[PDB]
Design a protein around this ligand. Structure first.
Ligand code: 2HO
Ligand code: 2HO
Lengths: 367, 367
């Protein structure tokens, strides 16, 4: 109803909220942010059935407590064009006035009662995340997940909690490749020894913008609520049974090669100028790369020397998807990587030599 | 047929050539760059009926002179993924081989005889441009020209040469606004005392990427050829008669106000958060800005103090298009601008206080 706020505090809060608004129809409440002034806090939220964010900023002054709404895109556009001095926000019946020095604006509010109730859960599982490993895993695994996947449970990331062993397993897949990590020594508070949540990709991406470390993750098996000092975020979970990835992962590998990450990146990028798939050939002191599904009369080839010789009898040949192989290497923190293989026709593994550590299993390309 | 070249020289030449290729159909000669090795130069060109570029780079070594062609997008994609060391280019019948250390590529060449003849003109008009004023004019005027304009001659920029007075006039318009400059003391060599060329917008944009100063501009009234040390560019000219802009420009102005450029930019940007048109009100010591065609219940207002008072009897009101007014101010080099008006319903002028100097005439918005 009446306050002053810091321009930068307000702008930053509004930026984050943009992604939770349906902006195209400005006449719908789904384009508005809900506003609430109580004590010395402005609360801003945007949500619906699926997903939502609640944020707050401190008022520089507060004169009048109450509630309202405002078009979030328009609000952000106005504040962005203002100077750093404090901004006065003030209702005038069903209109919000915005003032700074000689500049003043009016926007219409809607009925705040039309705004969805921001949900709260009775948590069945809860963790406190005090380090970046979880978001690191999220970031490294996200590229393998197809948001528009036509199968529902593969459109999100698996979080598998084992309370008994204090581990959080995180898994993404598109059916051609599967990336995973298991995070150790996580103090999990749960009503069950084993429990699984599937977060939608859309939610995953939002979390990467909002959180880094020092946040809680809580779930009742229907919603996941993530919270820190300034923000409360929620998303609906995805219903199905995520693939048994432990069954999918091979038992052992016939061969394991320790290889140069950046040299393989460069070599693959290079051959991928003319194709999407590549023929890798490994010899004792050499790795050869050749474009595979290139159009005829178009070829790309290169090789790198392997100084510390491989354990090979003549030559191992492997067809690979370039993008997938690169994204697997991109997920690694080490200067070297381990490539574990069985037959050239069976899935192969990429992982770090010896933050989360993300491994990727991958289907090869034939011939 | 056989040479080595510097990677950076080759990459840079290829980047410029990209815009002269139809890249989507890789099976057509229109996706290829023509190649010619003679003396210690590789000549690269891409052209068609409308527009073209010829470039050259120096060979580090030359062994075999001749001609061929290559897909320009693919060539650029390959070279971009290579290291800085020299690159060997070498024909193998109707294929171009590209080699650097352990990396080698083949791409197919097409019949070089299918490539269009690069045109040459007998110039009717010629200038040497030894300073940036021309491209400065081009850059400042380009925003007012609609490339997809449904009327042909307004889809380009007018260049009007007066050999008698040694002036080059440059003019753009979209019918709502007209931006112009007249450049003085240009040594024009022409067969006529007065002559006009209309360059297409597409060509204008290319010229801005390729040229700055120390180039020749030549025309036969059908093509324009622009040339410097490394590059020869051409474009077809547009046929019609460009509007008589000297008739269009007003005789005198009832009032002329000297105003703050950045303050007006900020004020207009600010009000344009909620509208495309703005009501400007000028008073003796004040300028007020208000959103005009904003949706109802949405308002944006601001004002700035004018210390050195205006010559006004009460208040001058003027409806303006925000984007147009901003782009007019963006074209100015001065910290202040002059706004010249007659009736609030008639065209008004924006120009610099007291490089090219671009003035913009503009139709107002009513009420
Ligand atoms: N989920 C699967 O069916 C699958 C099987 C083999 C793979 F290599 C893979 F990446 C995924
Ligand atoms: N070319 C025209 O018809 C024209 C007339 C008045 C203007 F203000 C203008 F910018 C253009």
């Amino acid at each position: 109803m009446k306050i002053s706020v810091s321009k930068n505090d307000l702008e930053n809060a509004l930026r984050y909220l943009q992604a939770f608004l349906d902006k195209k129809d400005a006449s719908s409440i789904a384009s508005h942010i809900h506003l609430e002034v109580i004590k010395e806090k402005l609360f801003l939220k945007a949500s619906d059935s699926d997903i939502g964010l609640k944020s707050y900023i401190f008022t520089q002054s507060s004169d009048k407590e109450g509630v309202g709404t405002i078009n979030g895109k328009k609000f952000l556009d106005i504040i962005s064009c203002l100077k750093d001095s404090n901004i006065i926000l003030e209702t005038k019946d069903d209109s919000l006035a915005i003032k700074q020095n000689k500049s003043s604006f009016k926007l219409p509010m809607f009925d705040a009662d039309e705004f969805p109730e921001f949900p709260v859960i009775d948590p069945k599982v809860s963790i406190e995340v005090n380090a970046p490993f979880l978001v690191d895993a999220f970031k490294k695994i996200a590229p393998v997940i197809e948001q528009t996947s036509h199968k529902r449970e593969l459109a999100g990331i698996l979080m598998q909690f084992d309370q008994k062993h204090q581990t959080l397993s995180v898994v993404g897949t598109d059916t051609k490749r599967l990336s995973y990590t298991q995070l150790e020594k996580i103090s999990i508070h749960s009503t069950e020894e084993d429990i699984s949540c599937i977060l939608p990709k859309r939610a995953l991406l939002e979390i990467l913008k909002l959180f880094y470390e020092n946040f809680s993750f809580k779930s009742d098996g229907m919603l996941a609520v993530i919270e820190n000092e300034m923000h409360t975020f929620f998303t609906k979970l995805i219903d199905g049974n995520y693939p048994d990835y432990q069954k999918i992962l091979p038992k052992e590998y016939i061969s394991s090669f320790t290889l140069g990450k950046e040299e393989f990146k460069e070599s693959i990028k290079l051959c991928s100028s003319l194709s999407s798939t590549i023929k890798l050939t490994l010899e004792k002191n050499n790795a050869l790369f050749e474009s595979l599904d290139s159009e005829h009369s178009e070829t790309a080839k290169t090789s790198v020397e392997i100084e510390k010789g491989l354990d090979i009898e003549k030559a191992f040949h492997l067809g690979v998807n370039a993008k997938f192989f690169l994204e697997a290497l991109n997920a690694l923190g080490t200067t070297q990587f381990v490539l574990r293989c069985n037959e050239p026709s069976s899935p192969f593994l990429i992982q770090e030599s010896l933050n989360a550590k993300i491994s990727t299993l991958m289907m090869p390309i034939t011939l």
